[model samples]
Target: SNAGRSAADHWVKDEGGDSCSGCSVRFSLTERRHHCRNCGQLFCQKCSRFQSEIKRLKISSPVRVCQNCYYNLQHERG
Candidate 1:
């Protein structure tokens, strides 16, 4: 049953490894690592600062997401 929040249906985990998946900004303690709840990819604050509700991910609350995902969401809604 789709009870509560499921990782596959609602969100994904932050697999710490590569740089910002969108801008390719290297993550560091000072730089900070941001996780896009939409795609579940890693990103820097600058690249993933845009907040929005990722419908596909069942995220109704505003959360940080990458520019790419943000743009796509806007475009889809527009």
Candidate 2:
């Protein structure tokens, strides 16, 4: 699960290219890209800025995740 490590470091490569998988934002040299550890998807910093612990992944500490994954994680807990 690669828990306790940098989530993004082990995240599966997002095949969507530089565009954000969430908001569909086009990434440029100035608009840095980010990876969502929870879904292993590419997203812009704004879309993937939320950090939370993914219980399914057994990550106790908060890690960068996409907004969709963050909501999904919360729903799983509810």
Candidate 3:
């Protein structure tokens, strides 16, 4: 299986990740914790952005995605 030890579709609870999942940057009032709709991971504004639907998440509209996931989704045709 390709599953990671600490990963899945579950929404991370009220207290989100202590740091950005991508760059390990800490979250704060200014550097807020952003979530990638595709992988449901935590990230900071600098590492995440509003991209359109990701097939993995079956989203029909725009949602926040992390840098790595965005790269993997760059060639999304649908």
Candidate 4:
């Protein structure tokens, strides 16, 4: 892990398109939106269902992650 890493490279704007990245599900205030810290894409609560450390981003507090990020990030820990 890069100690004290930086994420300015990726912090995606929450003004994401009104659709989930994983499932392409439409989102509204009622559907909800989430940000994947690793990939910086938007997803619905169902797709962005897991939380884990984003090591290269230097965060270890179990932040939000989408399905792909969770799968890729786990390769780092496991």
Candidate 5:
């Protein structure tokens, strides 16, 4: 049974709260529209970098990313 299989394994979801886990260089958790700059896998701030307060469109879903892809996005964007 795939009971634990989550449909959201690929996207960064909103926790409905605006904040990231305590840290010194607190990176603003990625927004709903933001993708992982490393692996292209989706992750909420609780799981990844930062958080987003802006509600996302219902029609749009999160995306799965890998650490490599995320790192690429960072260099490309930089």
Candidate 6:
């Protein structure tokens, strides 16, 4: 299994445009910093933010969330 790592550096270009293979959300390459904000996945110039770093270091970065994920995590910790 492919261990969850960084977002795909280069987006797969074809007919879809900016749709990501990993995420359901259709995104493109121009969106370099695609942070999930919900899951803390930091996508690259092509893909969406991925869930890797935060998973590895679970408690270091309190602001680990992209923005969307922050609320839940915040309420839980608070």
Q: For every candidate structure, what is the RMSD over all alpha carbons to the true structure, in angstroms? A: 9.1, 10.2, 7.0, 9.4, 11.7, 9.6
lDDT of 2 at 52: 86
TM-score comparison, 1 vs 5, better candidate: 1
On lDDT, the stronger of 2 and 6 is 2
Q: After superposition, how far is residue 38 of candidate 6 from its true place, in Å?
A: 7.3
Model 4 lDDT per residue over 4-48, tens place: 754766555344577787666778877778777787888888876
lDDT of each: 0.76, 0.76, 0.73, 0.76, 0.36, 0.42
lDDT, candidate 5, 1-78, per-residue tens: 455555755465443334322221233534333344333334444454442221122212334333333344346436
For model 3, what is the error of residue 42's alpha carbon versus the real structure, in angstroms, after optimal superposition?
A: 0.2
Give the RMSD in angstroms, all C-alphas superposed, for model 4.
Answer: 9.4
Worst 10-residue lDDT window for candidate 1 reads 6-15
lDDT of 1 by residue, 7-50 (tens): 55535444457677765667878677867888788888887677
Candidate 6, superposed: residue stretches over 4 Å from native: 1-57, 62-64
Question: Where does model 1 exceed 4 Å of error?
Answer: 1-19, 23-26
1 versus 2: better lDDT goes to: 1
lDDT per residue (tens digit) for residues 15-70 in model 3: 45667876677788878776788878888888775455677677777778887777
For residue 67, what is the lDDT in candidate 6? 33
Give TM per candidate.
0.60, 0.57, 0.61, 0.60, 0.22, 0.27
lDDT of 6 by residue, 2-72 (tens): 67754658574442334433444455454444444345455444342323224333554433244334444
Scored by lDDT, model 1 comes in at: 0.76
